[PDB]
Amino acid sequence: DREEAAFLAASILIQHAHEQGKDDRELEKILEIAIRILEKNGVDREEAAFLAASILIQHAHEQGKDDRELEKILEIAIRILEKNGVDREEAAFLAASILIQHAHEQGKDDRELEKILEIAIRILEKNGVDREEAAFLAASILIQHAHEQGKDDRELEKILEIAIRILEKNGV
Numbered sequence: 001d002r003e004e005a006a007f008l009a010a011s012i013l014i015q016h017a018h019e020q021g022k023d024d025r026e027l028e029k030i031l032e033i034a035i036r037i038l039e040k041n042g043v044d045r046e047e048a049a050f051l052a053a054s055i056l057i058q059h060a061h062e063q064g065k066d067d068r069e070l071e072k073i074l075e076i077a078i079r080i081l082e083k084n085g086v087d088r089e090e091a092a093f094l095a096a097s098i099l100i101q102h103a104h105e106q107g108k109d110d111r112e113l114e115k116i117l118e119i120a121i122r123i124l125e126k127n128g129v130d131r132e133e134a135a136f137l138a139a140s141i142l143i144q145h146a147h148e149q150g151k152d153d154r155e156l157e158k159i160l161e162i163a164i165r166i167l168e169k170n171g172v
Contacts, residue, residue, distance in 0.1 A: 006041035049084035096120035135170035
């Protein structure tokens with residue numbers, strides 16, 4: 001597939017740059033190239049930005065990045081989405097959605113899973129939504145992803161318990 005070939009090339013490029021130990025500006029140029037390469041190959045602009053953000057965020061989470069430089073990475077992803085015609089709030093939601101889903105698919109336990117949710121909450125809140133809505137949105141991402149993955153009734157309750165602790169931790 002042509003879209004798939006472009007995604008593979010974008011993935012190779014983005015991951016190699018982030019592994020060389022490459023800062024925020026030089027990383028920005030890399031992402032722009034990736035996005036332009038995606039657009040040239042039958043992906044629309046917002047989707048091309050989204051794919052780039054996915055590659056970046058997933059790659060960083062798999063390299064074992066502490067909570068600090070992880071949310072530098074998320075803020076970098078959010079600006080790239082905005083620069084390509086995505087609303088700032090929608091952009092943060094998309095970055096949070098990428099992060100939480102990737103964490104839930106790797107197999108992160110309850111402690112690491114709450115760490116991820118609170119990172120996602122910080123970033124929703126930094127980009128224009130209040131604490132209580134941001135916690136709600138994070139809860140929404142988790143529960144919906146778990147249901148779509150086909151998780152059983154024991155594990156769904158555990159997921160809902162995760163979400164409840166997250167909510168009441170943020171003034172609900």
